[PDB]
Amino acid sequence: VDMYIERAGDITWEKDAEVTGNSPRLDVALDESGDFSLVE
Amino acid sequence: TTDGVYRVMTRLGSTQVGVGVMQEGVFHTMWHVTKGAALRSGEGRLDPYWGDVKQDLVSYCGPWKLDAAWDGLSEVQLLAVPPGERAKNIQTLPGIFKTKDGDIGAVALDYPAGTSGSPILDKSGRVIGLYGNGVVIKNGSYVSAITQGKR
Ligand SMILES: NCC[C@@H]1CCCC1(F)F
């Protein structure tokens, strides 16, 4: 299984970016396997 | 070895399994993308150097170099590199993961799995973390932590 990388761009901020998405505030826990889960 | 954002590909045909960041000679991606396997870059090989399953992060060729953090107030940009698509910037105001150990920025953006490892940027262009470890809220909406390592 060949895993390989290809360059896709510079790391830059773009002044003309599409803007979208909410900003939810969530209670979460992070377990030993790196998995986030919701908490109540 | 050039600074930049990179696709992580696997092989019949090829498939994009994720994305990563080259900075200061070190390649940064998420553990779940590569599981720590070595990577080919042209005719050269990149060997894993550090990784941690709980943080879901791995670095190649040297220690983790990215250390900028979300300022908690400002919009950020996901520099998404989806499979089959040109790198593109998506601007958003992060929400928050509140945890017993402190708060983590989170972006409520849902891109294909092969986008995991895409960098999230602050206004100065610094990588404040990587996209693709997160949680699902209601109606199948995914929310990604802004996952940053330690330099
Ligand atoms: N291919 C082995 C993976 C290594 C050992 C644990 C950390 C690491 F991901 F770099």
TrEMBL record, chain A:
Subcellular location: Host cytoplasm, Host perinuclear region; Host endoplasmic reticulum membrane; Host nucleus; Secreted
Superkingdom, natural source: Viruses
Signal peptide feature range: none
Its biological purpose: Binds to host cell surface receptors and mediates fusion between viral and cellular membranes. Efficient virus attachment to cell is, at least in part, mediated by host HAVCR1 in a cell-type specific manner. In addition, host NCAM1 can also be used as entry receptor. Interaction with host HSPA5 plays an important role in the early stages of infection as well. Envelope protein is synthesized in the endoplasmic reticulum and forms a heterodimer with protein prM.
Subunit (UniProt): Forms a heterodimer with serine protease NS3. May form homooligomers. Interacts with human SPCS1. Interacts with non-structural protein 2A. May interact with host ANKLE2; the interaction may cause defects in brain development, such as microcephaly. May interact with host SRPRA and SEC61G.
Protein name: Genome polyprotein
Annotated gene: GP1
